[PDB]
Amino acid sequence: SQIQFTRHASDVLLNLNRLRSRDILTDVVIVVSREQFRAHKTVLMACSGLFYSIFTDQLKRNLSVINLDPEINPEGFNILLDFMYTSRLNLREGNIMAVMATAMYLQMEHVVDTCRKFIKASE
Amino acid sequence: SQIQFTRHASDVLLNLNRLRSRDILTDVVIVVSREQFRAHKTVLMACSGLFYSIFTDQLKRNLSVINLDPEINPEGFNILLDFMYTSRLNLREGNIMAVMATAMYLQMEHVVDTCRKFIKASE
Ligand SMILES: Cn1cc(C#CCn2cnc3c(c(-c4ccc(O)c(C#N)c4)cn3CC(=O)Nc3ccncc3Cl)c2=O)cn1
Ligand SMILES: Cn1cc(C#CCn2cnc3c(c(-c4ccc(O)c(C#N)c4)cn3CC(=O)Nc3ccncc3Cl)c2=O)cn1
Ligand SMILES: [Ca+2]
Ligand SMILES: [Ca+2]
Numbered sequence A, B: 001s002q003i004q005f006t007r008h009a010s011d012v013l014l015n016l017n018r019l020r021s022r023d024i025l026t027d028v029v030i031v032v033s034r035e036q037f038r039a040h041k042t043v044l045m046a047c048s049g050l051f052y053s054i055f056t057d058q059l060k061r062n063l064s065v066i067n068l069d070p071e072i073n074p075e076g077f078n079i080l081l082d083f084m085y086t087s088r089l090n091l092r093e094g095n096i097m098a099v100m101a102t103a104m105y106l107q108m109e110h111v112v113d114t115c116r117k118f119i120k121a122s123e
Helices: A008-021 A041-047 A049-056 A074-086 A096-106 A109-120 B008-021 B041-047 B049-056 B074-086 B096-106 B109-120
Strands: A028-032 A035-039 A065-067 B028-032 B035-039 B065-067
Touching: A008 A074, A008 B008, A008 B041, A028 A041, A028 A074, A035 A041, A035 A074, A041 A049, A041 A074, A041 B008, A041 B041, A049 A096, A074 A096, A096 A109, B008 B074, B028 B041, B028 B074, B035 B041, B035 B074, B041 B049, B041 B074, B049 B096, B074 B096, B096 B109
Parallel strands: A028 A065, B028 B065
Antiparallel strands: A028 A035, B028 B035
């Protein structure tokens, strides 16, 4: 008989995005081609099987820079990082394949499943 | 026309609680009477006006221990910390006043408002 606050998690997440936008307590840079994106390892770990697997390792947890593979589309990554911090996924025919490839690489099932639904719902 | 993932923020928050429960990337201890609670400053800042005000200050951001006032009820704090990381508030006649005093101190409006509703809904 606890009281569930349906909007609390969204409120937290939006505030974490504000922290990211002000570089407050960010602790890692993700390098994708010529792009650098700062973020919070905790959020990355909470949103991605790949990042979880990297930073849960006692040896790799202290890394401050992670390089993603050169074949990763930087726009795909930016779209997924924004999703991580906002719950909103900008998905369009022009980017679905990049988003889906990136979400598979990052090990983000809900997004991959949604890309499947997008595909199934397009002609 | 972005796709909103209604459960994403909750999924993130639950994973952040798992990180807390394993002391992964925790960076502060909150001391309330004889109790010590480890947490993530980012989450505290995202959930509390008091903690936001403390750690947004460039001078106090690097603190690893925060002492709360001796008159703060440690159970009230534990209840609110759990709420921060789960969205679930364990509110009962036996603890409402402690929870509400602690939520006012921590500057958590939604919880304070809910305590008001609890009061208004009790005889
Ligand atoms: C080839 N391929 C593989 C896949 C996959 C997969 C499965 N998977 C695994 N790990 C994941 C997640 C998601 C996740 C979370 C919210 C989302 O909204 C989405 C989306 N969207 C994803 C996060 N974490 C990491 C994780 O659990 N942290 C964790 C575990 C235990 N204690 C503490 C921590 Cl922090 C996830 O989906 C997709 N394609
Ligand atoms: C005497 N009294 C005062 C009050 C109050 C108040 C107002 N207040 C202020 N700051 C707050 C919050 C809540 C909050 C969030 C989710 C919740 O579910 C609840 C609850 N529940 C609370 C969080 N933050 C901190 C904040 O905004 N971080 C922030 C701001 C800008 N960029 C980055 C960051 Cl991280 C808040 O409610 C209540 N009683
Ligand atoms: Ca490579
Ligand atoms: Ca005092």
